[PDB]
Amino acid sequence: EVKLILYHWTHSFSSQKVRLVIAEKALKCEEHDVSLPLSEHNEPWFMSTGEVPVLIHGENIICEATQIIDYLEQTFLDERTPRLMPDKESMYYPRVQHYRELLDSLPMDAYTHGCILHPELTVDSMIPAYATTRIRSQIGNTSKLLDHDNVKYLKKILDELEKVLDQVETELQRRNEETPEEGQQPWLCGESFTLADVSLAVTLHRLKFLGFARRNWGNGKRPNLETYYERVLKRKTFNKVLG
Amino acid sequence: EVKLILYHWTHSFSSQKVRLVIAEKALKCEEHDVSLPLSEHNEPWFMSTGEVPVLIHGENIICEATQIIDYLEQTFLDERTPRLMPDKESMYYPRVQHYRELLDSLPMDAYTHGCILHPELTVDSMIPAYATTRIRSQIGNTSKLLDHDNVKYLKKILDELEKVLDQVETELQRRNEETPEEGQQPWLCGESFTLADVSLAVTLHRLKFLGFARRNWGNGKRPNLETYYERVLKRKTFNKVLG
């Protein structure tokens, strides 16, 4: 009876995760993309403010992406609805809860800023040369803070990204050992798809866009992570949201 | 071209101020009241959570009532649009800014809670006896924090309310002296209607509902404040929003 009403930016990292949770929970929702198509100068989304999506479910109006996702989990508990979180006392809950926080803490806003401002560190980046040169000209005429110390701050957080991926690479390795090679493979934290998988999937996809995917995984580096990303790419909910 | 889209609860104090700002700025907006009419037990709004309205203006999605109001002021600057804030260097800006904060700091949530839980301190309260007895029964079976120390905390903040109204009473007195008795009277902070007047108007109206209006003003107590409330009641924008 009640309608779900999401207001989001199509190319917003926080918003993307929310959409996927909806897709994973198989909920009918009236998504309202507010992002403008292209402007006079086709001002893309990778060029700061602090804007966040908002969900409206009847009397409840939830802002912030993490709050909306948690709301969805608690609100919709129909028997058909799939839960992206395990039981509080489940052996999986510590893992889902630990790795979900580990991935959400990554400063994606900073990674984006660095990708444009310093393409020297990127590999097969989907952000073009015109973007880099364009914003450098904007700087010359004049978020600067997210650049922070220039190339020195950027390399620092990119190495921290490797450390986080190292944890995830290890976790996936554990899954492959426990699971027989033939048979249904499990996700990051157990066989069922969880909120931790959502954060991981979206994070990896965004990294691919920034060109940091090649240097982190692939070519036999972090083989389990590479396999994971390929598996999640084929997933139907993933393809629908992140098409 | 772009549509304003407000999502609000009809009987939400924070939301009410936003609506009035829209009405004062004479902006066409698509207000979406999310409040449910009446439920099975007609659960009224004075019976906690922390929910806040959300504005959607094209790409911008602003939450929190104070942020939305500020956004409206900066966003819509058409020559026809009336500004509820003076120039930053205007003599009125310190006053509008001081008294706007003084009124927004009042814990209306607490005052509401006290009105129901302790009608002994109220006078001609619009909350009925069934409400008081109803929630006391709910307590017996079991925001408790906003009750805090029971009647001792409640009296404390009600006296602090008198102190704030004392400041406002003094400010209005100043206006009457400066203005000739015959001629257009000015509002709290100057002749033009400001955001300070919005906060003051809504605050007074809500107090009336809680029954704390009689003991604070009226019967010759705070005569300028009484006159103010009568004047703002007749105002068209006020009648439309707080009808």
Residue with tokens 């009532």: B65
Q: Determine contact: B61 vs chain A, CB below 8 A.
A: yes
For tokens 């990292």, name the residue.
A13
Nearest to A61 among B34, B59, B60 (CB): B34
CB-CB neighbors (< 8 A) of A52 in chain B: 61, 63
Q: Which residues of B touch A34 (CB under 8 A)?
A: 56, 58-61
Q: Check B54 against A52: CB less than 8 A apart.
A: no
Q: Say how far apart CA A197 and CA B19 lie, in whole Å.
A: 41
Give the A window 13-42 contacts with B, CB below 8 Å: 32, 34-36
Distance CA(A88)–CA(A92), nearest Å, equals 9
Cβ-defined contact of B56 to A7 (cutoff 8 Å): yes
The residue among A56, A5, A52 whose CA lies nearest residue B35 is A56
Please state, in angstroms and as integers, the Cα–Cα distance from residue B27 to each residue in A175, B76, B81, B234, following that order.
Answer: 58, 9, 8, 20
Altogether, the residues listed in chain A come to a count of: 243
CA A18 to CA A241: how far, in whole Å? 10
Q: How far apart are CA A146 and CA A163, in angstroms?
A: 20
Residue from B2, B11, B59, B68 to probe the interface with A (highest A Cβ count within 10 Å): B59
Question: Tokens standing for A235?
Answer: 């997933």
Contact A59 B7 (CB under 8 A): no
Confirm if A85 and A178 have CB atoms less than 8 A apart: no
Inter-residue contact A197 to A140 (CB < 8 Å): no
Contacts of A242 (CB under 8 A, 6+ apart): A16, A20, A201, A202, A205
Q: For this experimental structure, what is the resolution in angstroms?
A: 3.2
Burial class (CB in 10 A: 0-12, 13-18, 19+), B220: exposed
Picking from B128, B141, B134, the residue whose alpha carbon sits closest to that of residue B41 is B134
Q: Solving technique for this entry? A: X-ray
Contact A85, A73 (CB under 8 A): yes
Of residues B174, B179, B166, the one with CA closest to residue B216: B166
Tokens of residue B222, six digits: 């705070």
A53–B7 C-beta distance less than 8 A = no
Judged by phi (left if over 0) then psi (alpha if -120 to 50, else beta), residue B178 lies in alpha
Sign of CA dihedral B132, B134, B138, B143: negative
What 3 state SS string does chain A have? Answer: CCCEEEEECCCCHHHHHHHHHHHHHCCCEEEEECCCCCCCCCCCCCCCCCCCCEEEECCEEEECHHHHHHHHHHHCCCCCCCCCCCCCCCCCHHHHHHHHHHHHCCCHHHHHHHHHHCHHHCCCCCCCHHHHHHHHHHHHHCCHHHHCCCHHHHHHHHHHHHHHHHHHHHHHHHHHHHCCCCCCCCECCECCCCHHHHHHHHHHHHHHHHCCHHHHCECCECHHHHHHHHHHHHCHHHHHHCC
> Please, are residues A83 and A190 in contact by the beta-carbon 8 Å criterion?
no
Query: Taking CB atoms and an 8 Å cutoff, what residues of chain B touch A51?
Result: 60-61
- For chain A, the maximum distance between any two Cα atoms, rounded to a whole number of angstroms, is 60
- Put simply, the answer to whether A63 touches B56 (Cβ < 8 Å) is no
3-state DSSP of chain B: CCCEEEEECCCCHHHHHHHHHHHHHCCCEEEEECCCCCCCCCCCCCCCCCCCCEEEECCEEEECHHHHHHHHHHHCCCCCCCCCCCCCCCCCHHHHHHHHHHHHCCCHHHHHHHHHHCHHHCCCCCCCHHHHHHHHHHHHHCCHHHHCCCHHHHHHHHHHHHHHHHHHHHHHHHHHHHCCCCCCCCECCECCCCHHHHHHHHHHHHHHHHCCHHHHCECCECHHHHHHHHHHHHCHHHHHHCC
Q: Which residues pair with B211 in a beta bridge?
A: none
CA B15/CA B20 separation, integer angstroms? 9
Residue A190's alpha-carbon distances to A63, A111, A151, A157, B95, in angstroms, are 29, 29, 38, 29, 60
Task: Give phi and psi for B176, each to the nearest 5.
Answer: -60, -35
Task: Write out chain A residues lying below 8 Å of B59, CB-based.
Answer: 9, 34-36
CA distance B73 to B198: 13
Is the CB of A34 less than 8 angstroms away from the CB of B58?
yes
Cα dihedral value A96, A99, A100, A102, nearest 10: 160
Measure Cα distances from A54 to A58, A65, B54, B161, B208 in Å.
13, 7, 8, 34, 33
| Nearest Cβ partner for A59 among B34, B59, B61 | B34
Neighbours of B148 (CB within 10 A): 15
Q: How many angstroms separate the CA atoms of A210 and A60, rounded?
A: 36
Pairing mode of beta strands B4-8, A60-63: unpaired
Short-list A14, A8, A13, CA closest to A30: A8
What backbone phi and psi angles, to 5 degrees, belong to A136? -60, -40
Q: Which of A194, A201, A197 is nearest to A87 (CA)?
A: A194
Alpha-carbon gap: A241 to the closest alpha carbon of chain B (Å): 20
Q: Which amino acid is at A107?
A: P
> Domains, chain B, ranges and CATH?
4-75 (3.40.30.10), 93-241 (1.20.1050.10)
- C-alpha B43/C-alpha B27 separation (Å) is 32
Q: Is residue A151 within 8 Å of residue A117, measured between CB atoms?
A: no
